[PDB]
Amino acid sequence: MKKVVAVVKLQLPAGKATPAPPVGPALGQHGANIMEFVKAFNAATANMGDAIVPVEITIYADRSFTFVTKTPPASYLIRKAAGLEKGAHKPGREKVGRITWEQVLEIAKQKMPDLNTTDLEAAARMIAGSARSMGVEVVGAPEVKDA
Template identity: 60%
Template sequence: MAKKVQAYVKLQVAAGMANPSPPVGPALGQQGVNIMEFCKAFNAKTDSIEKGLPIPVVITVYSDRSFTFVTKTPPAAVLLKKAAGIKSGSGKPNKDKVGKVTSAQVREIAETKAADMTGSDVEAMIRSIEGTARSMGLVVED
């Protein structure tokens, strides 16, 4: 018989840096999950990813207080900021441009995000990433 799902917890946790402090501790503590067990498992799974990169994670908590989790790829905005070498996007993206990314960088980001995106093909995903870049005040160059 399948375990009964008690809750789904969605968080963004820095790769390799999960610890019991907020946001992880309070979110999992409410559900009665062993926080240190999650932190160790998450840090082990994100070991190969650059430390500090925010990783979305969906934790499924079962009624017997056990859990499973699925990690996603980092948000497109974070990858674009890293590619452009900027700290944050523009407050007025249509007027103030804060950086540039090449179409090769956009393609690389789209291929990285392919597992999590719903686009039918790579070109659709590239257009989606380009739209994110424009909304952040980045210029996409050929």
């Protein structure tokens, strides 16, 4: 008795969203509420910074909206697997925006269910290589042969 009916696969500006998004009405259907919409957005885009994110508000006719993407494509979750944590008082020696081979795989695997890719190396370079675009980098993916 619950099946998504509207997957708002729209986009949205970080640090720039407001009671006047490219949707507004096109979204007001989940019980009709905008601020909560942008509140959670501006609240996250503000908790992070400014940017753009593809929204995929998986809504179900039962009148519910499940979804929360953060940062442009890839970064939508690559940011998490990347290195966003800040920290407080640590011995030092560390960085931000660092993913791992497998992590980008699963993140790229589900991203390649049967569309057109095939080898984990393609979608991989995507999620991972995409991270490179974002400047992010992998944290492993060993490659040796001299034992």
